[PDB]
């Protein structure tokens, strides 16, 4: 029930402890420790920026308009969510991460433009 | 198609590359470099805080309820968006920046109170 306690559980279970991990991301002799702290902050901010770009700011679970490609993974939902962990999944699709991120960004750019026209 | 590539293009074209620039804002000897990194972070956060105050959090394009005053600039939409670059535009209205920002803040504060009452 603590930090990473769900790491060995399946994805459908681990998805319920997202706030446990999110809150553990934040908190000459002594300089290298500042470098680590400054860097930890920059890392955090880059992930938040990325969620903002994709239109997922402020939430831990975000649905999008990008369809899933069977070429990335052809497993079905009852297999992925019930008989696999997040560590395993991360390895399975590690080669498509950049493709997926690119698609999410493009989707949001189109979504913002459409909303702007509707508000005219 | 890279960072600032659209700087010489017109405003109506440059506005389609907002994610390119947003992603380039984040990433005794060695101290002056930590100072630069910390300040880059504080600068970033102040702009994000300001978008938050105005009710534009999480988005690159945000509509507001503050009307445009003809006294700030009386150019029409073609003059501003079909030709004119963002560098030129910023110079043209730099003297009204604080006025506009103050109006945006006031508008959001009123919006929040109206929303709160409508939920009670």
């Amino acid at each position: 029930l603590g930090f990473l306690g769900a790491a060995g559980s399946t994805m459908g279970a681990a998805s319920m402890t997202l706030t446990v991990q999110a809150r553990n991301l934040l908190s000459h002799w002594g300089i290298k420790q500042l470098q680590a702290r400054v860097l930890a902050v920059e890392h955090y901010l880059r992930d938040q920026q990325l969620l903002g770009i994709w239109g997922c700011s402020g939430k831990l679970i975000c649905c999008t308009n990008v369809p899933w490609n069977s070429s990335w993974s052809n497993r079905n939902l009852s297999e992925i969510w019930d008989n696999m962990t997040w560590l395993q999944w991360d390895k399975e699709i590690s080669n498509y991460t950049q493709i997926i991120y690119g698609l999410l960004e493009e989707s949001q750019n189109q979504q913002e433009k459409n909303e702007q026209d509707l508000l005219e | 198609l890279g960072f600032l590539g659209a700087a010489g293009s017109t405003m109506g074209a440059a506005s389609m590359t907002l994610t390119v620039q947003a992603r380039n804002l984040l990433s005794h000897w060695g101290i002056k470099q930590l100072q630069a990194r910390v300040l880059a972070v504080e600068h970033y956060l102040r702009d994000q805080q300001l978008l938050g105050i105005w009710g534009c959090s999480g988005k690159l394009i945000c509509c507001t309820n503050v009307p445009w005053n003809s006294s700030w600039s009386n150019r029409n939409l073609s003059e501003i968006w079909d030709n004119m670059t963002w560098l030129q535009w910023d110079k043209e209205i730099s003297n009204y920046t604080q006025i506009i920002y103050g109006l945006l803040e006031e508008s959001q504060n009123q919006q929040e109170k109206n929303e709160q009452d409508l939920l009670e």
Partner: antibody
Amino acid sequence: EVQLVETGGGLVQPGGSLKLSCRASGYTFSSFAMSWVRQAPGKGLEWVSLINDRGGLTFYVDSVKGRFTISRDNSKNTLSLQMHSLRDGDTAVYYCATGGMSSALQSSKYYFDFWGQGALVTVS
Amino acid sequence: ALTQPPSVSGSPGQSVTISCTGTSSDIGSYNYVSWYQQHPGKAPKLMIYDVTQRPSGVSDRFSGSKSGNTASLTISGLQADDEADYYCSAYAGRQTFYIFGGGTRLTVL
């Protein structure tokens, strides 16, 4: 000179389908929103559908909302309309027109600047 | 949807007015009124837009105006060549984007 040319269908039976298309020239196709306007042989004009210059947003008169699809191809300067279930009441001239909407950073429209000649669609 | 009269007429050189009456959440709310001229057998041509404006390409003999929920088209130096069905339309919001009246058969005497 701006031209809009319908190259649509003809006589079709009720309950079937018919596709219309319109070719454009003389202007940047991608700079304008477009629409279809219908005219029954004995009637006035009726707005039917509207599409955004980028093709992302479409609107329909409610009477065809579950039956018609409007689309766009900016590489081929082509506007199109796919009609299904073809009611006899849909017999009309279908005109290709430019206008009906603008795109936020542009001057407003809300009127139609150009018209084609009109395709005659007859449903038996 | 919009009401405009049939059979408006007059002799060359006489002015005529073709009215168009709508509703409050229509002509009464938006200044997006336009008029079209349709010669029988031909596609409509734009004559007036944004209530009072005319496109390049048409004469100044055509002028629009409005008050309340009523819009109208004024034709001044009426010509024989103005025989056509004149139509009014207006923007009426996002749920019902456009509405039109029937045509006015303008006859020149």
